[PDB]
Design a protein around this ligand. Structure first.
Ligand SMILES: Nc1ncnc2c1ncn2[C@@H]1O[C@H](CSCC[C@H](N)C(=O)O)[C@@H](O)[C@H]1O
Ligand SMILES: Nc1ncnc2c1ncn2[C@@H]1O[C@H](CSCC[C@H](N)C(=O)O)[C@@H](O)[C@H]1O
Ligand SMILES: [Zn+2]
Ligand SMILES: [Zn+2]
Ligand SMILES: [Zn+2]
Ligand SMILES: [Zn+2]
Ligand SMILES: [Zn+2]
Ligand SMILES: [Zn+2]
Ligand SMILES: [Zn+2]
Ligand SMILES: [Zn+2]
Lengths: 255, 257
């Protein structure tokens, strides 16, 4: 146990680092931030009046939920999991309820905002360096963790030498560079049959340039499984020239 | 006794704050929006550049005097239970710099208190002769963080044109430019705290996740033991409003009676 909790206790649960392959110490070239941060001034519309909100007097589980309507439909169930209706292959924007809404803090449409609740562990992989794995069975359609880091412009992103920790938001483009600041997500490797899917979300602000990226389970993840998502194409078109996917799956497109 | 609301905070706080009425027939106040955190309507440019943060490199629980954060606040004024030391100057309180996400230390170090939230058992209640008030339901040790004064961030320009100024609080006194918190349209339990000439609460300026020195946050600490059932109060600032409203705190030394 090279680290008992890489998050210095900021998260709800501890995320320990372990190594039983090589003799590398707990990674420490970065700053663990549990929430997104900015260096450059990024003007985000935190005008409260500009918030779309709902006036529900239920637990926002009726279809009168404005917040639910904005997201086409409240996609959450009673256990805070996605409905089987949820389009995994082309996910919609989700608008969770916010401090502007009339409803209570425990209504159905508050999930990603509550934080990560899963048991994760940073561990050393045989062939990919560091990786993240669950220590517990994860039901399908469960919110695992948020992709968090630094907010940068496409301008800023192109001049960045190290681009291995980036994530394109909307296509003007903004980015998250998890290189210098990030959370557990920065250590998640790629996979061609992924058990994780990114979903764009809005909570306390609805500035549509700056969605937050939540990973949901695409299937059951068994305790001990390593997480993975599809990095996309720009990665494996250039970086694929140098590296190569070693997901170890029958349908590896970038082997 | 009518429990007119089981929790005025819709569960945003760590504990529920219920409203009760056992004097007149007024329903739970509702011309405002309970926000647990400070908000802005107008764009207020606050420096949330992470690199602009002063931070510490403690590897302890920030209880050594090497604590940069502690140094900035002259001294970590907190004890192990998160209460102020008896050394704390009640009559002239310093700026406090709590530890932030930039620091090297853990989230449970000594110098994180106001940031953790309100933990005490409070209750919005109807007073006989002051309208609404806030009351503790439990003994409060002296030097305990009670609640934060929270609302809308507005300029002195904006504040002067505001008709209703009963819910204001001056932050950055002079320094060329002054900002305010107007708890009128958005606020928390603090907006209901009445004045008192022998106050059991004191405001203390604090910095946590940002150190933009125009925009301190205002934390109330207990100046003494508050017994379960006592109403809270602080000294407002009467300067003008006192030109007809006469204080009914009901203390022997009421200066605005
Ligand atoms: N499925 C995969 N197969 C091979 N290399 C991968 C991979 N997913 C990520 N990587 C490598 O991971 C690098 C950094 S991103 C992930 C962090 C890295 N695993 C670490 O040890 O900290 C990339 O440069 C990429 O080459
Ligand atoms: N010591 C005091 N005696 C009487 N009224 C007071 C008081 N301190 C504050 N108030 C009243 O509190 C008003 C608004 S601020 C606090 C809210 C107030 N308790 C309410 O009835 O909602 C002031 O305008 C003033 O009239
Ligand atoms: Zn809701
Ligand atoms: Zn709703
Ligand atoms: Zn809502
Ligand atoms: Zn592959
Ligand atoms: Zn600290
Ligand atoms: Zn320190
Ligand atoms: Zn510190
Ligand atoms: Zn008085």
């Amino acid at each position: 146990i090279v680290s008992r909790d890489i998050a210095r206790g900021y998260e709800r649960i501890p995320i320990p680092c372990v190594n039983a392959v090589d003799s590398e110490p707990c990674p420490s070239n970065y700053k663990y931030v549990s929430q997104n941060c900015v260096t450059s001034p990024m003007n985000i519309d935190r005008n409260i009046t500009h918030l779309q909100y709902c006036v529900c007097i239920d637990d926002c589980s009726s279809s009168n939920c404005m917040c639910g309507q904005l997201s086409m439909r409240c996609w959450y169930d009673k256990d805070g999991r996605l409905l089987p209706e949820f389009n995994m292959a082309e996910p919609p924007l989700i608008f969770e309820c916010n401090h502007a809404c009339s409803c209570w803090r425990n209504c159905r449409n508050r999930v990603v905002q509550n934080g990560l609740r899963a048991r994760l562990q940073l561990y050393r992989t045989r062939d990919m360096g560091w990786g993240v794995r669950s220590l517990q069975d994860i039901p399908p359609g469960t919110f695992v963790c948020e992709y968090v880091g630094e907010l940068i412009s496409d301008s800023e992103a192109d001049v960045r030498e190290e681009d291995s920790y980036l994530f394109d938001l909307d296509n003007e483009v903004y980015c998250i560079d998890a290189r210098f600041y990030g959370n557990v997500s920065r250590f998640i490797n790629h996979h061609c049959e992924p058990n994780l899917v990114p979903v764009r979300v809005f909570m306390a602000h609805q500035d549509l340039r700056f969605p937050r990226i939540a990973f949901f389970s695409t299937r059951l993840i068994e305790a001990g499984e390593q997480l993975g998502f599809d990095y996309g194409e720009r990665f494996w078109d250039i970086k694929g020239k140098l590296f190569s996917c070693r997901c170890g799956s029958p349908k590896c497109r970038h082997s």
